[PDB]
A and B are shown apart, each in its own frame.
Chain A
């Protein structure tokens, strides 16, 4: 292996990296964010200006922080499906 790395290079591209008890939280966050983006992209009907993922993710993070601090987190203009999905994912994270 040493001689191969000496005469070949890193070959670093295309290699996977296992989750090793220090990346667990930072990877769980990625998976949850991807899942919420998927649900957002699905429940929005056709031609409803899809450019709204980042703000909904910000709303989800704020809801999680409010739950951690025991604050109601009640938002005026949020549509019902988005609010329900955010509550669902926040409950998942809280149970974890």
Chain B
């Protein structure tokens, strides 16, 4: 119909004249698509707002990572006769205690790994330990349904906390109050006054086993993640839940508080996510660890460690959410390949040594390579702007 001819300039003036570098690679060239007919009163405004949202997202996923130095194995302590399920470090950073499946709580010397006394008195596997920083006590819990208070001045059990219909999987101590929280298979987290052994609060909101726990002084004070894949933020004053976080798809087995940033990270089989506390606002993913994440430990200098059920170990840069090191745990000689696993882990008080509890009857201690030199120990390479996250 040759109403007009010669796309010769149009076919070039259209493609060329814009920002040369791709901004989000899907930028619709806002100025180019006004001139079509259609429904610009509503659809165009919605499309422009959406384009703004996606460009904001793609730009905000591009934080430059920091170096952070790699980690290496330094000690392999092999004394336990069962899977090591829990670990805690005393506030003075002199010794740490680990429970295991052989009913025993072994107290080790942090600097040397030399075994101090071994505590016995549990009927089944020990699943949680906590050394009180304000009392000379050591609380423990196990699949034998009872929570014990060991007096570390006499190495003897003094208190028993009784109400629990099934095994207990986690134990945490309130930083300020004289109260402790335990959560177990009865789908209930229970709040115990230390002195009177009374179950003041029964935080019953979940539908299945509460596999994780976290306690702090600010509200939310108790954070429980369970088999439901739901994380619940509790109001300890009233014993009622405030916010429920259902972003996870599978059971959330790891909860961890950032020491200095008032945020916490939770992990599950699919993804690791972290939130801002007062409202539980989602703040991003730590993608890359495709394994059953059992542990999460945040350092003081913004380093997060995620240990998996198959021995996979990934160190993350907290700020940028970048996995800067992949490590595979190697079993001690007598074990099977299926025996590679990690159940508990914890940074020591300084944050320079990482303690790992294995499905291997071994405790492994990891140390940053001391030479540093970002030129000689590069992290995993970082590639920006591949695509916006699906979300």
Contact = CB atoms under 8 A, between A and B. Distances in A.
A72 B383 CA distance: 48
Nearest to B83: A92
Contact of A85 (B83, B146, B249, B338): B338
Interface string A55-75: 000000000000000000000
Contact of A42 (B167, B251, B337): B251
A85 B269 CA distance: 15
Q: Is the interface of A mostly helix, strand, loop or mixed?
A: helix
B281 interface: no
Given A19-B123, A27-B143, A88-B339, 17 more contacts: A19-B124, A19-B145, A24-B124, A27-B144, A31-B124, A31-B143, A31-B185, A34-B209, A38-B227, A38-B251, A42-B250, A42-B251, A42-B269, A42-B309, A46-B249, A92-B82, A96-B82
A31 B292 contact: no
Contacts of A87: 336, 338
B74 to A, nearest CB: 26
Contacts of A52: none
Given A31-B125, A87-B336, A92-B83, A16 B164 contact: yes
Nearest to B335: A91
B345 to A, nearest CB: 18
Interface residues of B, number: 34
A38 to B, nearest CB: 7
Contact of A84 (B82, B167, B211, B337): B337
Contacts of B81: 95
A88 B123 contact: no
Nearest to A90: B338
Q: Is the interface of B mostly helix, strand, loop or mixed?
A: loop
A18 B146 CA distance: 8
A43 B163 contact: no
A14 B146 CA distance: 16
A96 B359 CA distance: 14
B253 to A, nearest CB: 8
A53 interface: no
B145 A88 contact: no
Contacts of B162: 16, 18
A88 B269 contact: no
B250 A41 contact: yes
Contact of A34 (B123, B145, B185, B269): B185
Nearest to A80: B338
Interface string A19-33: 100001001101100
B144 A19 contact: yes
Contact of A88 (B146, B164, B338): B338
20 contacts: A16-B163, A16-B164, A18-B145, A19-B124, A28-B143, A30-B166, A31-B185, A34-B185, A38-B211, A39-B292, A39-B309, A41-B250, A42-B269, A43-B269, A43-B292, A84-B337, A87-B338, A88-B336, A88-B338, A96-B101
